[PDB]
Amino acid sequence: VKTLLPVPSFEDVSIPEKPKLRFIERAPLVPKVRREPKNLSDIRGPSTEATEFTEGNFAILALGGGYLHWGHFEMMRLTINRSMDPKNMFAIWRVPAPFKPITRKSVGHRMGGGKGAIDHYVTPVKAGRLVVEMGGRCEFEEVQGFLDQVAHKLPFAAKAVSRGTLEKMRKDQEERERNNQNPWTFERIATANMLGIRKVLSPYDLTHKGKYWGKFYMPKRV
Amino acid sequence: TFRAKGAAAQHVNKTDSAVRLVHIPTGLVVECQQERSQIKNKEIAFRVLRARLYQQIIEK
C-alpha cells in the first residue's frame, strides 16, 4: 500500500490583476543631461537593499555584481511571461528601470577631448539582491525550470531561490562559520592588521571579510 | 576590406582602408575609400549602400 501525503492548498493566495511583468524602457521618461562618473562601487560588496522577499515566494538571487541593460530586461520579461501561468502565477520587478548613464565616445577617437556622450543606461546590481520575484498558486519546482534558465543569462552569477532555499542557504553559511576548525580567519587577521596584511588589502576588506573580490562573490569563504 | 587607391604615401600600402560591401540578395556592390579610417569608410559605404538599396526597394 503506497503511503500518500497531504498536499498544500493555495486557495488562500490571491493573484493580482497584472500577473505578467511590466514593460521596462531603455531610458527614463526625462533624459539625463549631467554625465555621471563611473562609480564602480555601486556593484561592489553585498547588497543592502531588495535582499528579502516582499510578496512572492520565489525569486532570482544575484550571486555577483553587474549591470543590467535593456537587453537583459527584455530577456527576463519575455522568458518569464512566456513560461509562466498567469492564472496561478504572478511576477514583479525587484530592480529599477535603467537609470545610470553610460557614456561612449565616437569610434576611432583618440584619448582626450572631454567625456563621451551618453549612450545607454544600466541598472547596478550587487550580490545578494533579488532581481525578479514570483509567487502564487504554484510550487518551487514549477517555477525553478525557467527561473534558472533566466538566471544563467544574466551578466552576473545568479540562481533561482525560494523562501526555504534562501533561508537554508543563509543558515548553512552561519553553520559553516560556527564549526570552522581553521584557527585563522580573514576577518580576524584583517581587522587586527596581523602581519601588516592591510598594506596589501583594501579598506573595504574590513567589512567584506574576504567574501567579495571586485564584483565577484565567493559563497565558500567563511 | 582592401587597400585603397591614390597618392597617399605609406598608409595605404599597409592599411586596408577601403571597404567593399556586397548585398547578396540583390548583388549591388558599394565601395568607399575617401576616408583614411576603414570605420569611417565602412559607415559611409553603408550609407551609400542603404541609399542605393532604398531605391531598389522602391523599385521593388
Partner: peptide, 18 residues
Amino acid sequence: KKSGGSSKNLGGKSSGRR
C-alpha cells in the same frame, strides 16, 4: 586619425582657500 571633440567645461581652476 579622427578629429575629436572639445570639453565644454571651463573654469574651475581655483586653488584651495587654506
